[PDB]
Design a protein around this ligand. Structure first.
Ligand SMILES: [Zn+2]
Ligand SMILES: [Zn+2]
Lengths: 73, 55, 472, 51, 320, 51, 30
RNA sequence: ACCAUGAUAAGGAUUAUAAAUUGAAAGUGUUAAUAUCAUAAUCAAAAUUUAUUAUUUAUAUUAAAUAUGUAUGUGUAGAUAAAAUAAGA
């Protein structure tokens, strides 16, 4: 699992999901002078990345011993 | 993005790939048969924009 | 329009010029001269140091540590014959001790001659350095390594003069010299590296000397050079079961080297993926060198069951090289700590299989595609390989027609249009009208035009029929 | 990444007039730095709708 | 067109002339088959108490014509230059009219005439199963039946390439095969007529039945063997490619002589003006109209009057 | 798309079995025995107050 | 002339053009 | 550009010997009239955009009038869920 890991007590580790779309053409826009703007048009249209995290994974203990997310949090 | 005269000659020429439906039906997409052109007009909005929780 | 080929790859530049390959070969010969020049300068310095302390100190007896310092420096530079009269008088004067004997046998493996053999002769292959060190007096240095081992154990019995019937075989000095013996015997020929897991290891067991982790790693490296992998993995399996705290990197370096010699490239992948998974012990640059060289030996290996009908299949194994180099960035292994012979083949795989996002937006332009065609047209004789010349498991009696209503669902428009006059006696069965059976876009309009043409033809034919026989 | 490399290279031997797109949902560790993003009390003069 | 030898591949103007004619493609688009759309029906052109002429105009994308003579008494039909992109209407027309297809007349063996000849004999030969159809042609066209496969490569007719022509098969004028004694649908074609170039008004005719005679006239210049059809009782002249409306045939093709074409135009000056000339291409005319308002015939006799010994007339832009 | 989905799935079955198997041979060596990473040991002893 | 839709849409033959021809990088810009 | 296209109307026949099924419905032939501009030497109608006392059909505005006498269409349209004054000479 990639991502940075914090060992200091002021840094909490949140295991989260990232969903993204990568799309490349292979039929007509695979290679020609139109491939430059069409591949960029596919990347801008697929610019979405979904950052998902469970609230159950946020209910862990912090570096100071207190819970990260309590009921009121 | 052509006119009605150009669309028939592409059909009669065989260039594009289109499936013919009976001219009094609504095709095969269930969203078009349900509410018409306006219901499919809202379904593309639900796919492009409204399925994303914007930040 | 004529269709373009979708299984034809994009034309991109993956190669070097003839000047650049000549300049790589010219620059690599200069540093091979530089390592040859660096060794012979220091070899002449220790030989001048030897003749100075033999000539001007002819009658003046030297202190034993100066003669010990010169004896290890002679043995490191491959001069074992100039050092054996020095160690014979130091053993006779009883000036050598437990650490001094292990220093001399470790010096007898020559870790200065092996540095010249690595950069110049072995082409920076760490497996080939053991194969080439065995020629420069491999049997001769092995006999003196066995003689200095007998000089060591005789001195350890004097130095230990309770545990009295178990001395010096139970001390730390007995295994340290035995680990020094196996390290020196690895640099010898094939007859002595084969004797390390069989003859030296049973002699260590018969003498009752407790081994260490460096004992098993040199035995695993000895079985790696022989090509016996069923025994080399069994030793680490003994280490995985009993002594798992002390396993260092060199046991993995023996297994990466060993499957490279046995040409089992699927096994050496699993050892590298294991080392990325556990991340302890730390991956040395010798780990990245031994694994990447196993990729290049697998990539340059020809196959013989398709017999290369189209191209070389094993060249696709160089696509893993950008994956391994990305793993080295997170393991803390610097890619600048790779040898010059390997780094040219690593960058050979990089310009063949790697692209950036800025280049991927510009690599398919028609100017670069048509430059590839003309450069193949102008000079293709310089760069070409061809120009050189229900549930089925509980189903058995299937339930058919279970009254599933197809009339609640609506698929009413399944009308099909067949050609006119299939069973007509005047219309022939074979004809060019049979090609109308394969037509999908204008299926409705063609066959109704075909039926209108065939109805009017049979009407005009039968009205010509009635006119001719009524006139005669 | 050996499976991600093999999955991305299926585009080169697809069928006639048949394309594909790839979706990847992977787990990634995210750090919430409580020093760069601290939990502070609200200010004395709070913000309004005019901000 | 021709075989790509070494000097044609190393010539720059071969790569340049293919850029001028066809643009950036460089390959000439062929002459395709007419589909089942944009196709007309078989028309009855002439009805007479002796014979019946039924025809179809523009049956190919070469703009060729397909005709058939129907004898009223013998119920025997005869195709002239059998080249239709759909020889399925012609099989249904003879099947619904109680006709018997006995011979196929061919004026000349260009690709505008014998492109669907194997399709004509197969489809019409299959209907008579529930005596085969003959081919009447001139042996001077032997050079054009060898290059029938070359003509199909240039005009994109790849489906009719690998088809042995029925006139190339062993007829009665050929030596026979000596087959092993342990199959004559393709081994021997007994119904085959080879027309001679010595065509006269006395004996060079085909007895069509009930007293009408089809006098074939040898008239080269557009092709090595060009046999017209003349029906003097009905004032009908199947000129083929020799004479069209206000134009004559091409000479810019191989084995086409301009001075042979001018002699072919002079051998029809004894026929009356009401002889309705029926060409292989385009609209039909009369021979009296072409004697007045055709510039190719006007130039042919003007050079003859001023003293040209070798009068050379002929087109370079027109029909094949 | 149905016949391609039989072509890609059989490809990803034989490839996906191979990559899991070379991962399965790495877990069974890690379960037989190994030494703990001191960077991993310092990660557990990182917080000030524990549970 | 074309490929029909009921035929199996397999790849007819693979093309290895970039591994038979190793081209060096040639740009008109410096 | 004067080709031999194609549209209109009209008459014919075959099958139901079952009360089951959501559902007893589908295929094949002849005559009259109308009509036929593609192997040739060009160019901006409404290719085509915009505006002024003026030409229409539509758009909505739009009214008086009991002294007598008085004012009937063809069509245009939307989805489609009643039926016997004419002679099978
Ligand atoms: Zn001709
Ligand atoms: Zn012709």
């Amino acid at each position: 699992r990639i991502g940075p890991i914090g060992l200091e007590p002021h840094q909490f580790n949140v295991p989260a999901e990232l969903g993204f779309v990568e799309q490349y053409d292979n039929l007509q826009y695979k290679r020609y002078d139109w491939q430059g703007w069409y591949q960029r048009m596919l990347d801008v249209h697929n610019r979405n990345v979904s950052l998902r995290c469970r609230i159950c994974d946020l209910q862990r203990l912090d570096g100071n011993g207190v819970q990260f997310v309590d009921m009121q949090t | 993005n052509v006119s009605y005269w150009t669309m028939n000659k592409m059909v009669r020429g065989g260039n594009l790939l289109v499936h013919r439906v009976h001219y009094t039906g609504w095709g095969t997409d269930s969203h078009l048969k349900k509410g018409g052109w306006e219901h499919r007009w809202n379904k593309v909005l639900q796919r492009n924009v409204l399925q994303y929780s914007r930040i | 329009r004529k269709p373009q080929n979708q299984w034809e790859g994009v034309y991109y530049y993956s190669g070097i010029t003839k000047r650049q390959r000549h300049l790589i070969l010219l620059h690599r010969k200069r540093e091979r001269e530089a390592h040859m020049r660096s060794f012979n300068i220091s070899r002449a310095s220790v030989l001048q140091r030897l003749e100075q302390l033999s000539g001007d100190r002819k009658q003046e007896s030297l202190p034993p540590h100066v003669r010990l310092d010169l004896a290890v420096r002679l043995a490191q530079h491959g001069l074992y014959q100039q050092a054996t009269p020095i160690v014979d008088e130091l053993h006779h004067q009883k000036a050598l001790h437990a650490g001094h004997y292990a220093l001399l046998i470790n010096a007898l493996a020559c870790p200065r001659l092996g540095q010249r053999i690595l950069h110049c002769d072995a082409q920076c292959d760490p497996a080939l350095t053991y194969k080439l060190l065995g020629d420069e007096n491999g049997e001769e240095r092995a006999q003196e390594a066995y003689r200095w081992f007998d000089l060591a154990l005789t001195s350890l019995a004097v130095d230990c003069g309770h545990f009295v019937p178990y001395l010096p075989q139970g001390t730390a000095a007995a295994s340290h010299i035995t680990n020094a013996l196996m390290r020196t015997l690895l640099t010898c020929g094939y007859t002595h590296v084969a004797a390390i897991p069989d003859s030296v290891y049973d002699r260590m067991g018969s003498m009752g000397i407790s081994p260490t982790i460096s004992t098993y790693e040199l035995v695993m490296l000895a079985l790696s050079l022989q090509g016996n992998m069923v025994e080399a993995e069994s030793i680490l399996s003994f280490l995985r079961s009993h002594h798992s705290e002390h396993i260092t990197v060199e046991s993995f370096n023996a297994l990466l080297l060993g499957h490279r010699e046995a040409r089992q490239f699927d096994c050496c992948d699993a050892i590298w993926q294991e080392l990325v998974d556990r991340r302890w012990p730390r991956a040395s640059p010798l780990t990245a060198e031994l694994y990447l060289r196993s990729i290049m030996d697998h990539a340059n290996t020809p196959t013989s069951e398709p017999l290369q009908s189209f191209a070389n299949i094993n060249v696709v194994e160089k696509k893993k090289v950008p994956l391994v180099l990305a793993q080295m960035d997170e393991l803390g292994v610097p890619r600048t700590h790779l040898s010059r012979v390997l780094m040219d083949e690593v960058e050979d795989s990089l310009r063949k299989f790697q692209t950036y996002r800025s280049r991927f937006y510009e690599w398919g332009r028609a100017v670069k595609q048509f430059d590839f065609i003309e450069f193949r047209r102008r000079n293709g004789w310089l760069y070409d390989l061809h120009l050189m010349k229900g549930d089925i498991y509980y189903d058995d009696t299937r339930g058919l027609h279970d009254r599933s209503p197809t009339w609640m669902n609506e698929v009413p428009e399944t009308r099909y249009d067949r050609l006119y006059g299939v069973n007509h006696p005047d219309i022939a069965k074979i004809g060019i009208r049979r090609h109308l059976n394969v037509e999908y876009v204008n299926r409705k309009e063609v066959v109704e035009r075909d039926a209108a043409l065939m109805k009017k033809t049979l009407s005009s034919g039968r009205r010509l029929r009635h006119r001719v026989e009524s006139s005669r | 990444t050996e499976f991600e490399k093999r999955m991305y290279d299926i585009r080169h031997w697809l069928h006639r007039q048949t394309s594909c797109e790839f979706h990847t949902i992977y787990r990634r560790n995210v750090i919430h730095d409580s020093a760069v993003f601290p939990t502070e009390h609200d200010p004395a003069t709070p913000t309004t709708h005019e901000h | 067109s021709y075989t790509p030898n070494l000097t044609s591949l190393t010539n720059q103007v071969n790569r340049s002339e293919r850029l001028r004619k066809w643009g950036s493609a460089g390959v000439p688009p062929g002459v395709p088959r007419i589909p089942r759309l944009e196709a007309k029906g078989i028309a009855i052109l002439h009805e007479s108490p002796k014979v019946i002429l039924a025809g179809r105009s523009r049956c190919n994308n070469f703009d060729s014509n397909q005709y058939m003579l129907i004898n009223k008494a013998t119920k025997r039909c005869l195709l002239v230059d059998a080249s239709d992109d759909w020889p399925d209407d012609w099989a249904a027309f003879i099947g619904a009219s109680d006709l018997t297809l006995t011979h196929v007349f061919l004026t000349h063996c260009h690709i505008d005439n014998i492109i669907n000849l194997n399709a004509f004999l197969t489809i019409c030969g299959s209907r008579q199963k529930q005596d085969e159809i003959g081919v009447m042609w001139c042996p001077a066209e032997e050079c054009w039946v060898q290059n029938f496969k070359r003509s199909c490569e240039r005009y994109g007719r790849f489906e009719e390439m690998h088809q042995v022509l029925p006139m190339m098969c062993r007829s009665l004028y050929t030596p026979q095969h000596l087959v092993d004694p342990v199959r004559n649908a393709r081994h021997l074609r007994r119904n085959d007529v080879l027309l001679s170039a010595a065509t006269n008004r006395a004996t060079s005719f085909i007895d069509f039945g009930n007293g009408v005679l089809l006098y074939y006239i040898f008239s080269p210049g557009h092709s090595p063997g060009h046999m017209m059809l003349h029906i003097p009782t009905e004032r009908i002249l199947f000129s083929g490619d020799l004479l069209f409306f206000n134009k004559v045939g091409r000479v810019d093709l191989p084995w086409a002589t301009g001075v042979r074409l001018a002699e072919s135009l002079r051998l029809l000056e004894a026929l009356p003006d009401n002889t309705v000339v029926v060409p292989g291409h385009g609209r039909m005319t009369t021979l009296g109209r072409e004697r007045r308002e055709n510039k190719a015939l006007q130039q042919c006799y003007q050079r003859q009057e001023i003293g040209k010994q070798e009068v050379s007339v002929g087109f370079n832009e027109g029909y094949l | 798309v149905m016949k391609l989905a039989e072509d890609v799935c059989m490809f990803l079955k034989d490839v996906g079995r191979q990559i899991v198997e070379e991962k399965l041979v790495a877990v069974r060596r890690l379960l037989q025995g190994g030494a703990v990473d001191p960077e991993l040991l310092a990660a557990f002893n990182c917080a000030r107050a524990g549970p | 002339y074309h490929w029909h839709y009921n035929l199996p849409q397999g790849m007819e033959r693979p093309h290895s053009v970039n591994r038979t021809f190793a081209a060096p990088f040639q740009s008109n810009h410096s």
